[PDB]
């Protein structure tokens, strides 16, 4: 429906033929789904297409053309199939590397299924609201949006349920001041988005309120969907350092390749002309040794890592945050959903007992049962007691039942009593059901009926006229009640107040004692406050609520209800009744999680609604502070924080581990101050108010069970809201890194080997140790089997014992670049030494133990001077198989050196990555085929002796393991 | 067996790709 902003609500409902109270029928949904498509951008559409990509490379085709010119010169005159073989190998090297890249990219794309765009509809098939994938929303259905929600489609507003609807449309209009909405038509059909004040645009936010509307356009037809068509679409620090190093390596190898075409100056004449031989050998090294385009295994362990993370409940939204994740040095976490289970239970409570001048005594009680079940006893001095015998408890229960927007619900399949409203409130419902202050019959009730039986007995003694909702300035709420149907002696209207102890107790002029009343004094106040403190500070670190009644409340038309700031005044002149103490245990895995952070050099900062005293005590229980540690400079309330000068506030964030009772703007500030010390901070949040901080944080972390706005501003979502999930995500972050570095080390050294190998032959003047098709053969087996197996190796051993990596750190340290050269140098020398060994000290027709092989160039005509042997044993097919076999086996060996960055094979055995071992055996069974299955050794070279020759291949290759061990020792025992 | 089981799938595809390559060099001749 194109111009819905200009028509009446009644015209929009008319247009689609939809009831506003009902919503679309399954039949309508079905027909609309066909007519209008899904609420999404069209999927953009491969196996063969991606193979040709590699053949676009200039240096790849330079090889092919050189093997074509070499083939044509043969046909008009091994060398015959050379162009056919290379082509087959290079399609295979392409297939292997292009197939990994696409699967990694698909798996990473498939992360979006963990947190799919959701919408809320009323449809004809249910009375209740239905949460569905935004994708399945259709033009014409009835949509409900409220605070924190992302608008799922372009919607004409039907009715605003809250007093006011506030919308953040910045993403579409640039204005970042939330905007007011209405319901009347906006007559101008040409009107700009800014003027469509009755409209809700897909991709935007509800910054406050609640509204119902009808969907006008979806998918592409939507305002943001038109923009996303015309829209046309930044490298991470580790991507820059890898690209830059990619060019440093690329140009050195390119110079050395041309240096191979030069030093073989005169040799263009032996059996302008022979340069096609030394050119086609130089270009092959370029194709094998230079890594052009991102190696696929890299993107594979990122893909394997975030898949692992998602299974551990950390949903990565921003991939660049996987890089930041192992640099995090600070975690700021909210307490309730995250450090604690949020399973509330009242385990303690008290009322006033006796008051005599300075003297005040209390009736304390404890309550068993910690789930939401109405099952447990009320104890005093450890003895079971009946709450109704205490008139003050009758009143305390009346307050808990009336100051409450929650109920219990028995879930018949799960067999469990579940919560309806807020955990805190439901804990009070549960309590009330256990106290059963009026001795109502409950024993014969079904579990369904039992859930709220006692709460309703209370709820029938009065009418709940209205509620003074909670607000942050007073930290208390209240309800206003009149007696129902009229009792015997018409007692006046009442108010019941619950809230934070400190604030409500100050507003009390009286205290209840039984059913009698007595003036609030200093002595009574001190006694009330001391027990609040003991329970706040004791083993169970309880959250205390104070409960009061205003005995003589104002008249009704004295009280304005749309103005939250007059609410405190109405809640004065109170009568203190009693206190309840709530349990909310720390999660089981949290102490261990915090100790891991200590070990990894990560500071943890708790933010809580608890009072300061309690906040500290929780921190001692969970290991954030030591049970004796001084804390006076490391713990702050938002109030104390606001009273500090700016420089002092800053210094407080340098060292603080505990913030209690913070204004909504504090998180942002903490982020800023932490950044002023180059901290890499992770910050949790869930509300529309947490969004600015989540934006500023290096890693914003949103709660799975929280708002979409917080999720949209974050890098990561916690599926289970759990603090431990965060720590485990740092664990993976660091692991992925070490996995990249293990693959990078193996890739660089093996390619450097290829270079040193060939350069040594051309430099000294030796006969070619490896023919180009052999080089392209090894280059394919390694990159195909063992190299991709390292993408599947386990986490490195002590990644949570090193401190966090700096963002300014270089990708490859000098020491590491040494480990690249030293290892690459030994392989290059070992391959050329294995061919030269056959010539020097080997029993199969040798050269000279002095040095004669250098001048192999002069033989066929230069026989009588300094030879005395045949001159075709330099084209022999055995020295080139010794060089090949040493390369292949030292490549399998070099892979065992890539199981861990710094751990010895004595600690991390070869069988740690069991897939690596497999791919080796697969690599060997392929090698035992180009030496034995009889058409192939002809196209390459001929086999090595059954025993004695292999023992040299092994005694040459195996010290590569021994060498890297020393270099690992000079890294383990160096630190 | 769940995530480790995609290593066998990954290598087998690469093995087949390399093996097919050799058998084509066999046939040509
Ligand atoms: O719902 C019946 C309920 O009534 C009685 O409780 C009365 C009590 O007698 C009075 O003191 C008055 O304030 O109201 C109470 C709650 O209605 C029964 O004692 C009780 O067992 C029964 O459930
Ligand atoms: O107990 C002494 C006290 O009794 C009366 O106070 C009542 C109050 O007026 C009622 O609203 C009721 O709910 O609670 C009180 C009893 O605890 C007298 O009005 C008061 O002056 C007197 O001090
Ligand atoms: K951020």
Q: The CATH number of the domain where A599 resides is what?
A: 3.40.50.1000
Tell which of A728, A759, A788 closes a domain.
Answer: A728
In this structure, the answer to whether residues A285 and A187 fall within a common structural domain is no
Asked whether A148 and A713 are in contact (CB, 8 A), the reply is: no
In this structure, the answer to whether residues A376 and A516 fall within a common structural domain is yes
**Do the Cβ atoms of B10 and A788 come within 8 Å?**
yes
Rounded to whole angstroms, how far apart are CA atoms A703 and A720?
A: 8
Question: Is the minimum CB–CB distance between B23 and chain A shorter than 8 Å?
Answer: no
In this structure, the answer to whether residues A734 and A785 fall within a common structural domain is yes
Structure tokens at A473: 């300035």
Q: Is A582 exposed, middle or buried (0-12, 13-18, 19+ CB in 10 A)?
A: buried
Using a CB-CB distance cutoff of 8 angstroms, which residues of chain A are in contact with residue B18? 92, 96, 780-781, 784-785, 926
Helix (H, G, I), strand (E, B), or coil: what is residue A408?
A: strand
In this structure, the answer to whether residues A88 and A134 fall within a common structural domain is no
CB-nearest partner of B18 from A780, A915, A933: A780
Beta pairing, strands A154-160 & A603-608 = unpaired
Task: Print the domain residue range for A657.
Answer: 329-341+586-728
User: Which residue owns the Cα nearest ligand 2 atom 2?
Assistant: A517
Q: Please tell me the distance in Å from A789's CA to the nearest CA on chain B.
A: 7
Annotated active-site residue in A334, A584, A783, A796 = A334
CA-closest candidate to residue A296, choices A94, A109, A112: A94
- Which residue matches tokens 């294995």? A834
- Which residue matches tokens 């206003």? A480
CA distances from A936 to A80, A191, A353, A929, B21 (A): 14, 75, 100, 8, 12
Structure tokens at A404: 């409450």
Domain count, chain A: 4
**Which 8-state DSSP code applies to residue A856?**
T
Q: Is A418 exposed, middle or buried (0-12, 13-18, 19+ CB in 10 A)?
A: middle
Structure tokens at A686: 């869930």
Q: Is the CB of A457 under 6 A from ligand 1?
A: yes
Rounded to whole angstroms, how far apart are CA atoms A166 and A208?
A: 5
**Do the Cβ atoms of A92 and B10 come within 8 Å?**
no
Q: Which ligand is nearest to the CA of A695?
A: 3
Give Cα A639 to chain centroid, integer Å.
33
DSSP string covering A722-734, please?
Answer: -HHHHHHHHHHHH
Q: Residue A526: what are its φ and ψ, rounded to 5°?
A: -60, -40
In this structure, the answer to whether residues A635 and A575 fall within a common structural domain is no
For ligand 3, the distance from its centroid to the CA atom of residue A154, given in whole angstroms, is 27
Rounded to whole angstroms, how far apart are CA atoms A578 and A842?
A: 98
In this structure, the answer to whether residues A287 and A405 fall within a common structural domain is no
Asked whether B18 and A96 are in contact (CB, 8 A), the reply is: yes
Could you state, in order of their start, the residue ranges of all structural domains in chain B? 1-29
* Closest residue of chain A to B18, computed from CA coordinates: A92
Rounded to whole angstroms, how far apart are CA atoms A305 and A308?
A: 5
Sequence-ordered alpha helix ranges (H) in A841-958: 879-896, 914-927, 936-939, 948-957
The interaxial angle of helices A612-622 and A590-599, nearest 10 deg, is 80
Rounded to whole angstroms, how far apart are CA atoms A510 and A740?
A: 69
Angle at A670 between CA A667 and CA A671, to 5 degrees: 90
Structure tokens at A55: 């053949």
- Which residue matches tokens 């309800």? A479
Contacts of A742 (CB under 8 A, 6+ apart): A790, A793, A796, A898, A899, A900, A901
In this structure, the answer to whether residues A143 and A281 fall within a common structural domain is no
Give the H/E segment covering residue A700: strand A699-703
User: Which residue owns the Cα nearest ligand 2 atom 18?
Assistant: A517
CB-nearest partner of B14 from A304, A785, A936: A785
Q: What is the number of residues in chain B?
A: 29
> E strands of A570-698, at which residues?
574-583, 603-608, 635-637, 658-660, 681-685
The DSSP bridge partners found for residue A752 are none
Q: What is the number of residues in chain A?
A: 975
**Which 8-state DSSP code applies to residue A791?**
G
Give Cα A842 to chain centroid, integer Å.
58
CB-nearest partner of B26 from A781, A918, A936: A936
Helix (H, G, I), strand (E, B), or coil: what is residue A586?
A: strand
Helix (H, G, I), strand (E, B), or coil: what is residue A159?
A: strand
Q: Which ligand is nearest to the CA of A515?
A: 2
Rounded to whole angstroms, how far apart are CA atoms A903 and B27?
A: 46
Asked whether A179 and A194 are in contact (CB, 8 A), the reply is: no
Tell which of A516, A551, A585 closes a domain.
Answer: A585
End-to-end alpha-carbon separation of chain B, Å?
44
In this structure, the answer to whether residues A285 and A434 fall within a common structural domain is no
Angle at A244 between CA A241 and CA A245, to 5 degrees: 80
- Which residue matches tokens 């106040």? A525
For residue A484, give the CATH number of its domain: 3.40.1110.10
Beta pairing, strands A210-217 & A142-146 = antiparallel
CA distances from A869 to A439, A852, A861, A865, A880 (A): 117, 12, 12, 11, 20
Using a CB-CB distance cutoff of 8 angstroms, which residues of chain A are in contact with residue B15? 784-785, 922, 926
Helix (H, G, I), strand (E, B), or coil: what is residue A738?
A: helix
Using a CB-CB distance cutoff of 8 angstroms, which residues of chain A are in contact with residue B4? 792, 915
CA distances from A748 to A826, A869, A926 (A): 13, 41, 24
Give a three-class secondary structure readout of A544-584: EEEEEEECCCCCHHHCCCCCHHHHHHHCCCEEEEEEEEEEC
**Do the Cβ atoms of A95 and B17 come within 8 Å?**
yes
Q: Which ligand is nearest to the CA of A392?
A: 2
Substitution target from B21, B26, B27, B29 for chain A, most A beta carbons within 10 A: B21
* Closest residue of chain A to B23, computed from CA coordinates: A936
Give the H/E segment covering residue A217: strand A210-217
For ligand 3, the distance from its centroid to the CA atom of residue A108, given in whole angstroms, is 20
Rounded to whole angstroms, how far apart are CA atoms A172 and A190?
A: 18
Q: Please tell me the distance in Å from B23's CA to the nearest CA on chain A.
A: 9
Asked whether A606 and A336 are in contact (CB, 8 A), the reply is: no
Beta pairing, strands A635-637 & A658-660 = parallel
Give a three-class secondary structure readout of A181-202: CCCCCCCCCCCCHHHCCCEECC
**Which 8-state DSSP code applies to residue A369?**
-
Structure tokens at A256: 């050395």
Interface residues of A toward B, Cβ cutoff 8 Å, are 81, 84-85, 88-89, 91-92, 95-96, 99-100, 304, 307-308, 311, 780-781, 784-785, 788-789, 791-792, 915, 918-919, 922, 926, 929-930, 933, 935-936, 939
Q: How was this structure determined?
A: X-ray
In this structure, the answer to whether residues A357 and A434 fall within a common structural domain is yes
Helix (H, G, I), strand (E, B), or coil: what is residue A705?
A: coil
For a mutational test of ligand 2's pocket, the pick from A551, A552, A575, i.e. the residue with the most ligand atoms closer than 8 A to its C-beta, is A551
For a mutational test of ligand 1's pocket, the pick from A401, A437, A438, i.e. the residue with the most ligand atoms closer than 8 A to its C-beta, is A438
Rounded to whole angstroms, how far apart are CA atoms A859 and A840?
A: 17
Substitution target from A79, A86, A784 for chain B, most B beta carbons within 10 A: A784
For ligand 1, the distance from its centroid to the CA atom of residue A481, given in whole angstroms, is 18
Is the CA virtual torsion A189, A190, A195, A196 positive or negative?
A: positive
* Closest residue of chain B to A783, computed from CA coordinates: B14
**Do the Cβ atoms of B17 and A784 come within 8 Å?**
yes
For ligand 1, the distance from its centroid to the CA atom of residue A387, given in whole angstroms, is 14
User: Which residue owns the Cα nearest ligand 1 atom 23?
Assistant: A440
User: Phi-psi region for residue A917, left (φ > 0), alpha (ψ -120 to 50) or beta?
Assistant: alpha
Resolution (A): 2.8
Q: Side by side, which strands form the sheet with A199-200?
A: A130-133, A118-122, A142-146, A210-217, A154-160, A199-200
- Nearest ligand 1 atom to the CA of A460 is 17
A334 is known as an active-site residue: yes
Question: Is the minimum CB–CB distance between B16 and chain A shorter than 8 Å?
Answer: no
**Which 8-state DSSP code applies to residue A340?**
B
Q: Is the CB of A841 under 6 A from ligand 1?
A: no
Using a CB-CB distance cutoff of 8 angstroms, which residues of chain B are in contact with residue A96? 14, 17-18
Asked whether A321 and A714 are in contact (CB, 8 A), the reply is: no
Rounded to whole angstroms, how far apart are CA atoms A495 and A548?
A: 8
Rounded to whole angstroms, how far apart are CA atoms A577 and A910?
A: 70
**Exposure class string for A690-716: b at 16+ Cβ within 10 A, else e:** bbbbbebbbbbbbbbebbbbbbbbbbb
Q: Is A549 exposed, middle or buried (0-12, 13-18, 19+ CB in 10 A)?
A: buried
Torsion of CA A186, A192, A196, A200, to 10 degrees: 150
Substitution target from B25, B26, B28, B29 for chain A, most A beta carbons within 10 A: B25
Tell which of A585, A610, A640 closes a domain.
Answer: A585
For ligand 3, the distance from its centroid to the CA atom of residue A332, given in whole angstroms, is 13
Contacts of A333 (CB under 8 A, 6+ apart): A339, A604, A605, A606, A607, A684, A723, A726
In this structure, the answer to whether residues A552 and A646 fall within a common structural domain is no
Asked whether A331 and A376 are in contact (CB, 8 A), the reply is: no
User: Phi-psi region for residue A707, left (φ > 0), alpha (ψ -120 to 50) or beta?
Assistant: beta
In this structure, the answer to whether residues A70 and A149 fall within a common structural domain is no
Asked whether A703 and A771 are in contact (CB, 8 A), the reply is: no
Known binder of ligand: residue A801?
A: no
Q: Residue A244: what are its φ and ψ, rounded to 5°?
A: -60, -45
For residue A122, give the CATH number of its domain: 2.70.150.10
Which residues form the pocket of ligand 2, taking CB atoms under 6 Å from any ligand atom? A 492, 512, 515-517, 551
Give Cα A775 to chain centroid, integer Å.
42
Q: Please tell me the distance in Å from A788's CA to the nearest CA on chain B.
A: 8
Contacts of A785 (CB under 8 A, 6+ apart): A919, A920, A922, A923, B11, B14, B15, B18
DSSP string covering A115-154, please?
Answer: S--EEEEE-TT-SS-EEEEGGG--TT-EEEEETTPBP-SE
Q: Which ligand is nearest to the CA of A440?
A: 1
Known binder of ligand: residue A188?
A: no
CB-nearest partner of A88 from B10, B11, B21: B21
**Do the Cβ atoms of B22 and A926 come within 8 Å?**
yes
For ligand 2, the distance from its centroid to the CA atom of residue A510, given in whole angstroms, is 10
**Exposure class string for A227-265: b at 16+ Cβ within 10 A, else e:** eeeeeeeeeeebeeebeebbeebeeebbebbeebeeebe
Sequence-ordered alpha helix ranges (H) in A264-380: 275-289, 296-311, 320-325
Give Cα A11 to chain centroid, integer Å.
45
**Do the Cβ atoms of A785 and B11 come within 8 Å?**
yes
**Do the Cβ atoms of B18 and A785 come within 8 Å?**
yes
In this structure, the answer to whether residues A63 and A3 fall within a common structural domain is no
**Do the Cβ atoms of A788 and B19 come within 8 Å?**
no
DSSP string covering A315-338, please?
Answer: EES-THHHHHHTT--EEEEESTTT
């Amino acid at each position: 429906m194109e111009a819905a902003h200009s028509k009446s609500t009644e015209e929009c409902l008319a247009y689609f033929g939809v009831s506003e109270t009902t919503g679309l029928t399954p039949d309508q949904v079905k027909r609309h789904l066909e007519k209008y498509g899904h609420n999404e951008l069209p999927a953009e559409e491969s196996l063969w297409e991606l193979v040709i990509e590699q053949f676009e490379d200039l240096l790849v085709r330079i090889l092919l053309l050189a093997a074509c010119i070499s083939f044509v010169l043969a046909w008009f005159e091994t060398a015959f199939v050379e162009p056919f073989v290379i082509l087959l190998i290079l399609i295979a090297n392409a297939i292997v590397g292009v197939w990994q890249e696409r699967n990694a990219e698909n798996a990473i794309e498939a992360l979006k299924e963990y947190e799919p765009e959701m919408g809320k509809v009323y449809r004809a098939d249910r009375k209740s609201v239905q949460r569905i994938k935004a994708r399945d929303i259709v033009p014409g259905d009835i949509v409900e949006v409220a605070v924190g929600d992302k608008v799922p489609a372009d919607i004409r507003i039907l009715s605003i349920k809250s007093t006011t609807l506030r919308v953040d449309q910045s993403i579409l209009t640039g204005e970042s001041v939330s905007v007011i909405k209405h319901t009347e038509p906006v007559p101008d059909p040409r009107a700009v988005n800014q003027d469509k004040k009755n409209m809700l645009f897909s991709g935007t936010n509800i910054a406050a309120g609640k509204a119902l509307g009808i969907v006008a356009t979806t998918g592409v037809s939507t305002e943001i969907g038109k923009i996303r068509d015309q829209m046309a679409a930044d490298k991470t620090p580790l991507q820059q350092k890898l690209d830059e190093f990619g060019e440093q390596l690329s140009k050195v190898i390119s110079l050395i390749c041309v240096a191979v075409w030069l030093i073989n100056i005169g040799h263009f004449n032996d059996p302008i002309r022979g340069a096609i031989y030394y050119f086609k050998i130089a270009v092959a090294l370029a194709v094998a040794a230079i890594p052009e385009g991102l190696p696929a295994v890299i993107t594979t362990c990122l893909a394997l890592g975030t898949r692992r993370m998602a299974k551990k409940n950390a949903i990565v939204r921003s991939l660049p945050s996987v890089e930041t994740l192992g640099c995090t040095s600070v975690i700021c976490s909210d307490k309730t959903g995250t450090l604690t289970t949020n399973q509330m239970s009242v385990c303690k409570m008290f009322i006033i007992d006796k008051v005599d001048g300075d003297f005040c005594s209390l009736n304390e009680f404890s309550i068993t049962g910690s789930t939401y079940a109405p099952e447990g006893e009320v104890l005093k001095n450890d003895k079971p007691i009946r709450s109704g015998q205490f008139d003050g408890l009758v009143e305390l229960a009346t307050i808990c039942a009336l100051c409450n927007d929650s109920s219990l619900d028995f879930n018949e399949t799960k067999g469990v009593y579940e919560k309806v409203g807020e955990a805190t409130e439901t804990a009070l419902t549960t309590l009330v059901e256990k106290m059963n202050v009026f001795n109502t019959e409950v024993r014969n009730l079904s579990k369904v009926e039992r859930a709220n039986a006692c709460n309703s007995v209370i709820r029938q003694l009065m009418k709940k006229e209205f509620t003074l909702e909670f607000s942050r300035d007073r930290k208390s709420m209240s309800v206003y009640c009149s007696p129902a149907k009229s009792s015997r002696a018409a007692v006046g209207n009442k108010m019941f107040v619950k809230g934070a102890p400190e604030g409500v107790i100050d507003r009390c002029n009286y205290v209840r004692v039984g059913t009698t009343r007595v003036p609030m004094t200093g002595p009574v106040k001190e006694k009330i406050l001391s027990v609040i403190k003991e329970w706040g500070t004791g083993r169970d670190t309880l959250r205390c609520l104070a409960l009061a009644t205003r005995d003589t409340p104002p008249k009704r038309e004295e009280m304005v209800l749309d103005d939250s700031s007059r609410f405190m005044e109405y809640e004065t002149d109170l009568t203190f009744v009693g206190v309840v103490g709530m349990l909310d245990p720390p999660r089981k895995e949290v102490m261990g999680s915090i100790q891991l952070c200590r070990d990894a050099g990560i500071r943890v900062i708790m933010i809580t609604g608890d009072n300061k005293g309690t906040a500290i005590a929780i921190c001692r229980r969970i290991g954030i502070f030591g049970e004796n540690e001084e804390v006076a400079d490391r713990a702050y309330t938002g109030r104390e924080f606001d009273d500090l000068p700016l420089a002092e506030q800053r210094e407080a964030c340098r060292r603080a581990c505990c913030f209690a009772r913070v204004e909504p703007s504090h998180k942002s500030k903490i982020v800023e101050y932490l950044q002023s010390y180059d901290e890499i901070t992770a910050m949790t949040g869930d509300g529309v108010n947490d969004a600015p901080a989540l934006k500023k944080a290096e890693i914003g972390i949103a709660m799975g069970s929280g708002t979409a706005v917080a999720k949209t501003a974050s890098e990561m979502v916690l599926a289970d809201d759990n603090f431990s999930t965060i720590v485990a995500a740092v664990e993976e972050g660091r692991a992925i890194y070490n996995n990249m570095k293990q693959f990078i080390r193996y890739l660089i050294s093996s390619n450097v080997g290829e270079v040193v190998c060939i350069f040594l032959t051309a430099a000294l003047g030796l006969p070619e140790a490896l023919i180009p098709v052999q080089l392209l053969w090894v280059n394919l087996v390694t990159d195909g089997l063992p190299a991709t197996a390292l993408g599947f190796n386990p986490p490195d051993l002590d990644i949570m014992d090193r401190p966090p990596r700096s963002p300014k750190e270089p990708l490859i340290s000098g020491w590491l670049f040494f480990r690249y050269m030293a290892i690459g140098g030994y392989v290059g020398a070992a391959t050329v030494g294995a061919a030269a060994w056959w010539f020097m000290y080997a029993e199969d027709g040798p050269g000279v133990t002095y040095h004669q092989l250098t001048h192999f160039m002069q033989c066929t005509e230069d026989h009588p001077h300094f030879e005395g042997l045949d001159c075709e044993i330099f084209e022999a097919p055995e020295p080139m198989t010794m060089a090949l076999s040493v390369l292949v086996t030292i490549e399998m060996c070099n892979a065992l050196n890539s199981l861990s960055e710094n751990q010895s094979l004595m600690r991390m055995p070869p069988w740690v990555n069991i897939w690596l071992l497999g791919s080796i055996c697969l690599s060997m069974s392929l090698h035992f085929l180009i030496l034995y299955v009889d058409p192939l050794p002809m196209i390459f070279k001929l086999k090595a002796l059954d025993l004695t020759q292999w023992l040299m291949v092994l005694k040459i290759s195996l010290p590569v393991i021994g060498l890297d061990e020393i270099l690992k020792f000079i890294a383990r025992n160096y630190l | 067996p769940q995530q480790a089981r995609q290593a066998l799938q990954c290598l087998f595809i690469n093995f087949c790709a390399i093996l097919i390559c050799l058998l084509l060099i066999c046939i040509i001749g």
